[PDB]
Design a protein around this ligand. Structure first.
Ligand SMILES: NC(=O)c1ccc[n+]([C@@H]2O[C@H](COP(=O)([O-])OP(=O)(O)OC[C@H]3O[C@@H](n4cnc5c(N)ncnc54)[C@H](O)[C@@H]3O)[C@@H](O)[C@H]2O)c1
Lengths: 336, 336, 332, 327, 327, 332
């Protein structure tokens, strides 16, 4: 009934709801294209598995024979440009679709994040409705809490196998820790009269095509590469707080007045899901340092340190970058 | 010992600590210049009395004879430009000082807000030290709570008289109400694991040299003139929330897409004391509407309404404008 | 419900300087055409001069005195500033003011007469009907103002409502009346002196807009007209100097600003020519205004001249000379 | 006593009063350089003789021995760029000076228009003057009226001879007529309480690298090439004045609204001596029309090349006005 | 049959092949307009005769009856702005056309350089050609070698007569020499696997409204006025090449570092026929020096006015390069 | 504690293509001068070509094979990309890489020899000492690469360490060796054909940088050199076309982009000339790159050509031809 069927998701993990839709797709179209979103996002409690792992997981639920008509595509996130995303999807799809006009998109409008499901009017849209009782969020929560009965009856058996092997790895132990932390963090705000909103700053300091970075020291994202930034204090201005944090986390050897006078731009980042803590809006300041020897910063140990990274280094380690920091850098790179 | 002595304050109200310093000034200099800060700020729980009232209050504590060597100056706030403030102080002072170089500034470095006390190196600075037990904040709190024994023994007798007459007015009843509200508002956050930070948007919509305004409907600032704005919701972007609030408070008859496409600039306002609620940082969006008939907006009743105001109207009613909204408008007026 | 009139609202715009019998005829026509009438007092807060001698509360008192309290229940007075170089701004102000009364009604008519060039605004309200009344001969506020400052009572007493006559007879004893006569005479002599010129004269002046730290350098006028009004430093261009030279010369004469000419020269960020034909009552005066932005810090000393804040300018709007507030507005 | 000596002037005409300084020059320096100012300026009552003609005059007054240690250099006027002029001057100097550092400039500050003798600081300046009094203004005045007695005693015999021959000239008639018109024009303002001040607009209209020009229909500079321009009326804005004047003088086939919309810039030209009628300040508006057919319109479109070739025939300072909007 | 008729060409020289179209023109329209292209272009082996000279030639070939219904119009070249050219063409047309709408343009698209006959769309176009074959390239080739037999049978008797007289000319020697040099230069590249491609830099140095110029020391266009410029060496960047070339040809007294810092702009000039040596693309760098003394340096500073006056003596397309950075 | 060496750290930068006996002599000198030696492998991730035949892990394996494990405890290998038009970027990368080893020490010396124009970088580390070694005759990596691709073993076997000889003898049997010989021969013939030209030839090409929605239009190279590498669409300028025409012509030839020339013409936002003397191995090639920004939406179809994301370009850095990555970087 269609030559091509597209199913997009994160599949973190692939569950019985997803398989139902993936089965429906196999009925409605000859070739099936699975699009693995959030490609190369750093692993966190919302996206635990890398996209090759997610492909293996899905493949393990299907037969070699049905796999003959199944195509995997991975697509990065561009949290601040839907158009860069759309284009990448079109381009990845085209390479399979030849160019055909016989194409459906299967999905369910679950919530606010499902808005993309109608940015393909070019193609047809098959809404599936909700399938009770299959919730990725519930599955992940159960899994990090070690409650097997709340997830085993919700994933394909090949998925349960995978979750059980993966339960042995270092990543799982780190993700359990990070999950306990967030849960406690959110719980500590449970008696607020209103959902809280968090304000942070971030410093984007660039010298001779390099950006000053740190390894995160506090949860969440412990150990990931990040911009130097943090929570605004009650009595400081955004610039002040930005400078205070830059100094605390990098001990950059440049006097505060030249730092101030080197701020050439700033920009607010407010994607509602940028941070799992929390609604967290960050104010990023772009600082351009002049030519010369690379500026000195604390050489603490290695997990304690700060260092300078070129764009090449940045792309090379894309999946080690915290939250949307790669996007913040890319925004100011478009400015220069 | 000096030809001229400068004492700057808000004096809300003038208390025994202030009188001590004002007396010390009268010993140390021939002429005394009192500078009434926060001129033409809308009345709130932090600045209850207008600057002519504050002058009357101070005059009532002094004798006609000593008043012969006392000079009053009023100066506006410019929360985002210390330089505009400094200049205005210099200019107001010069008109009394003739131009003399014999000038001291008396004060006490109480807290972060006292930072201005050393932006006059031109002139000498006499630090007085703290005088125990004389706190404006404590005085105001006591007064709005009606607890006379906590303030009577802290102000000059002429000040106690004034507070007692003023306790009859409509302003006092409104300020009591507003004070109860804030107190309860802050108390409701008392069990937060961290001081909360608030995020709001504000829309600065301009057509044919007019700015769209509202009369505030919620406390605090009930009844004051304000920009249309409000709290960001958890799942909306800043622009989205800005547009949602503009529509809720003005029902402006301009379709959302043309509104979006008319945003020409935005700017963050983060003076830590802009709002008495709360650390509240607002994100203001400047929208330029094209020439033509003045856009329709809700004509509700009068306290329920929205309307268009020229800069002239704005200056004419400066002391009816909420928090720092006049400053936000002035920022974008410097852009055009 | 059957209306007794064609429209809900009638708008009658003017200076009314003073209200004369022509104006009352149109006002009466408006009372026949609309249930409620809106009088718009233009030139609100303009420095009293020979073209605009009465302030808006005086003009409202004058018109009120011609009308019975039953009619006054149907009349609403609104004031609106002039913004000589910005018609869009003015159009919006009129609209916003009218809306306080109108509640948004679309049943609205503007009454007037396209008298001369200054009446162009009558076709800028297409959202409302327009009712041309034709000319009433000859009622002329210019002629009436002339007769009044010249003391020729026979030429205006039969041109104005009896209540206006009374008000005029009373105002005639004020200090403002004397001040106005003095200024009227000066302008009359001034134009006199050019009467034998082969063409109408065109005057060239320069004005200096000097700004540092949100303050504009202003002076009090030492010569007529507008004697004692607040103004920008400026004056007439001499025959052998450039505009910039004239500008700086005149700035030094009037303020004695303690800044070297060479740094004043280098501090000129912009300039603009202001040429509204009626900006000055002395004759056609076209002015060259120069925006000078001083590097921040302590304000330079001057010798009456002073640094005035933007808030203070708005606060003393009505003491400002000619178009000078608009000149400042243009730059800051 | 000096290797090289420089004397700059308009010499309109060359008078005894120059000659004496010229003589004083030949004494103080071995080589003498005479710079003829105002090169290629349209002929008018301030500047009647072309620079070749002025060369001829100053030559006749010299015997060849002398004429053979004197070099003649012409310099254009750029009324609004002194730097450009100083440069053109010192570059033309080098042609002869070769690069010498033993140089003297002679003259004296007579008025305001003699300001050009503080710069140059790289050479030595010897002040003569005042020689009271020979006055070219007075001499051109005398010469144009007919008061022969007032100037024969004032200029060298050879000059007088050339002036004499020139009276027959086709130009002398038109230049006489111009002198009468200006003297009358100025006279008509004598009852004014203050010196009058004239305001004009000029339109600079440019399409496909051509500027719209006209021949002047009215005195002064009648028949010269000019920008469309005129006197502001009492009740029009500068913009509306510029536009009516443009339509009057050229009847340009472009709708008024499109013309308003095509204004990309404007500039005020205010040199005190730009107009001989008295102090006239002009407001120039630069209109820039989209590519394509040249619009219908003596008025005609003229290229930047055309203008340069005919710089001689351009009114007043209209060339500098054009140049200002072009670079 | 038509009121007005237009025929545009370089006519270098006027050949039988033109004449026939000219004849065909006189037949089809009552008035004939001949537009002499390439007006004021320095004389070179593609364009040997000035436009007055070309007028003279085409006149001799006509009897006055005929010569009296033919008008001659000159148009400059602006190699990089066709619009400017089209405009100058149709404006000069109107001088004669008065404003007529019965007009025809004659010729035919021979090659790439004949593209200019699609525009104009406002007139009627009648295609002649091809007339196989008379070839000016071949004729100028013959003429410059000495192969008389190759062109006498190709051009009108009067043309031949003028060419004959011209052989004696001071120019014909230098133009012959140029032809030999180019033919040799091109010949030296015959063993190349592909047509060669030349890269040069030019420096456009500008202070106080003057541009630095030089006389060409090397063939081609020897002795003409040019920008300081040269061939890129194998291991220098364009910037460093431009700068060494600038110092070589002018010995400009300004430190290299200041010169780097004063570069405000650069532009590539790439018209296929700009250089007669073969495909040469030049990279022009615009250096803008601060006001004051003109720096020490045949090289000399030259005003925009000077350049316009001497446009005749300017190499290749160097005038257009200057003009590009000025407006 | 008494040091046995002058410095704590010695830095030796090169391509080492291949490591020969000259390099080993300097390396040995560095081991005498510093306690720890840092070898910087330049040209990391550059597409293998006749100037850079071995990738950095191969070059590290090669140098490792010449050294005893006791010496290797003192040697540290670091890699660094080329950024042909940005020396500041490169200088910073070297500094940052060195700092991983140095801990910030100031006791640091760079050893090398100012051989030719490409050695300019040796004076751009003033924060460190420089030790000029002088020239060793004649060891030449160019000559050794020449002999090796030409199969003349006598000309290089005695120029290189025995371990390098072994590695060379082994690599010689790979498919990459054949590919390199093929390309070497092509370039050699190419230059051959120009040998009788009166001056060194200068080549002119155009390149098109077409971008829509964060994607650059790329091709796979159909002709040598760099056959099968990813590249921008471009080629040689024809004799009678303009650069823009050439650019568009060549863009159409190589990609068959379904966009009309007139809209391609109107979409050129910027252009830049790239002229590093060694950008291309064929001879001096100077290129004109044109930035074309297509209006957003669906990407236009093409016919091998494709739209490549900026992330994918970085991911496939090493498959890119000549300086093309730097050309893209310049614009986006
Ligand atoms: N600009 C951008 O970078 C951009 C924009 C939009 C989306 N994205 C990316 O695309 C991906 C979006 O995928 P997702 O997070 O919505 O995928 P998901 O894994 O949550 O769900 C995949 C699909 O299955 C459906 N589904 C899940 N549970 C269901 C249930 N129980 N019943 C019926 N249907 C159910 C979902 O609605 C969805 O259509 C993410 O990677 C996101 O980051 C990127």
């Amino acid at each position: 009934k269609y030559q091509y069927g597209i199913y997009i998701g994160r599949f973190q993990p692939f569950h019985l709801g997803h398989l139902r839709t993936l089965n429906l797709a196999l009925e409605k179209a000859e070739q099936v294209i699975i699009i693995l979103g959030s490609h190369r996002v750093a692993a966190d409690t919302r996206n635990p598995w890398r996209s090759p792992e997610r492909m293996a997981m899905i493949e393990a639920c299907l037969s070699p024979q049905i796999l003959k008509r199944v195509h995997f595509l991975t697509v990065r996130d561009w949290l601040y440009s839907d158009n860069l995303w759309l284009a990448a999807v079109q381009q990845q799809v085209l390479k399979i679709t030849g160019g055909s006009n016989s194409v459906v998109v299967l999905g369910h409008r679950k919530d606010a994040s499902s808005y993309y499901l109608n940015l393909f009017p070019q193609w047809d849209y098959l809404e599936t409705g909700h399938y009770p009782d299959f919730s990725s969020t519930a599955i992940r929560g159960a899994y990090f809490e070690g409650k097997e009965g709340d997830y085993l009856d919700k994933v394909p058996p090949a998925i349960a196998d995978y979750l059980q092997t993966f339960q042995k790895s270092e990543r799982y132990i780190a993700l359990c820790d990070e999950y306990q932390f967030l849960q406690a963090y959110k719980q500590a705000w449970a008696t607020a009269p209103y959902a809280p909103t968090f304000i942070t700053t971030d410093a984007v300091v660039v010298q001779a095509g390099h950006v000053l970075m740190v390894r995160r020291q506090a949860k969440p994202g412990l150990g990931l590469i990040a911009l130097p930034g943090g929570f605004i204090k009650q009595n400081e201005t955004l610039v002040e707080g930005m400078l205070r944090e830059l100094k605390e986390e990098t001990r950059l050897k440049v006097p505060l007045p030249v730092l101030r006078g080197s701020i050439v731009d700033s920009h607010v980042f407010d994607a509602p899901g940028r941070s799992l803590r929390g609604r967290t809006i960050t104010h990023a300041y772009f600082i351009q340092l002049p030519g010369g020897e690379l500026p000195a910063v604390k050489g603490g140990d290695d997990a304690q340190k700060a260092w300078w990274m070129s764009l090449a280094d940045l792309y090379a380690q894309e999946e080690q970058i915290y939250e949307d920091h790669f996007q913040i850098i890319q925004h100011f790179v478009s400015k220069v």
